[PDB]
């Protein structure tokens, strides 16, 4: 099947949330390990002495459930690249704490954002965490195809947008990614989770992206169009992109809210299934090669040794 997951940042209770998510047909849930709004300090006397538990215990779930069903998210308030020294230090400490907790829970993957151009300090902290102890939690960097600054509407009088083609300006997000993985030295534990967004960039940009190690694809519920029957659907370009991604065996993560309230949230997932099926079935060559893709093997030398 097509591995699909749900992205939630408000999880009042894990048990019922997971029950509902499984009922809708999703395979995994992306949630925050710590409460998103629960800021924490580590260098201020009144704050650092905060009593009580810092987060819900891991006893709520079986060890198996943690290792397969859940995907951790980094808290939004953490900005390791802030210009303020105090905020930067607090963000570093909080991010380290969250990553350590994720390792303690043995989460299969951890989702971190790349919403801004500069990510040097974040890369340094993540690399330091990787080279510390032994753990197998993969890291997914959430990188929009189109930068947020370019997707904003032309509402500001004094800061109007521009309709210039900006052929070199459509690749900026990729640059953000390319630098980051360069800082972490092409670590095999870092992967991309690109966000489709409402509008696609030039086809060359998508072709370039498809060469990167994409593990997940974030689909906001706001990009789905409404058909005459009121169900969610995707545009032709979105459908082609989804086909190409499916050819890569990526994990789809539906995020957002049920805009088509008249229908059920599962209606979104069902549509992906409809796209999963009906796609061009693999040819004889593709079926033959299945299981040996991007797998390096030395060439044969029949002259020297016998087959």
């Amino acid at each position: 099947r097509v591995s699909s997951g749900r992205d939630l940042n408000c999880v009042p209770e894990i048990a019922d949330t997971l029950g509902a998510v499984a009922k809708q047909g999703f395979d995994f849930l992306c949630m925050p390990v710590f409460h998103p709004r629960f800021k924490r300090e580590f260098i201020q006397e009144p704050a650092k002495n905060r009593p009580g538990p810092q987060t819900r215990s891991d006893l709520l779930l079986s060890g198996r459930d943690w290792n397969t069903l859940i995907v951790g998210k980094l808290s939004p308030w953490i900005r390791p690249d802030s210009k303020v020294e105090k905020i930067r230090r607090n963000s570093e400490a909080a991010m380290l704490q969250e990553l350590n907790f994720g390792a303690y829970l043995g989460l299969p993957a951890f989702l971190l954002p790349l919403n801004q151009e500069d990510n040097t300090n974040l890369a340094r902290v993540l690399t330091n965490h990787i080279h510390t102890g032994h753990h197998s939690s993969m890291f997914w960097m959430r990188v929009p195809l189109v930068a947020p600054e370019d997707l904003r509407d032309d509402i500001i009088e004094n800061a109007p947008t521009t309709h210039t083609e900006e052929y070199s300006g459509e690749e900026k997000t990729w640059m953000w990614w390319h630098n980051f993985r360069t800082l972490c030295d092409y670590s095999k534990r870092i992967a991309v989770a690109l966000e489709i967004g409402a509008d696609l960039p030039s086809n060359h940009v998508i072709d370039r992206w498809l060469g990167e190690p994409i593990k997940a694809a974030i689909l906001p519920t706001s990009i789905f169009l409404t058909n005459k029957k009121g169900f969610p659907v995707l545009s032709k370009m979105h459908q082609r992109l989804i086909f190409r991604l499916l050819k890569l065996e990526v994990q789809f993560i539906i995020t957002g809210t049920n805009h088509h309230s008249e229908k059920e949230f599962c209606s979104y997932l069902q549509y992906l299934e409809y796209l999963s099926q009906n796609r061009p079935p693999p040819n004889a060559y593709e079926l033959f090669a299945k299981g040996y893709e991007d797998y390096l093997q030395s060439p044969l030398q029949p002259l020297m040794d016998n087959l």
């Binding site: 409404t226 058909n227 005459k228 029957k229 659907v233 069902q270 549509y271």
Partner: peptide
């Protein structure tokens, strides 16, 4: 379920 449930939006 519904006939043409996944038909593209026009």
């Amino acid at each position: 379920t519904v006939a043409g449930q996944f038909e593209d939006a026009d």
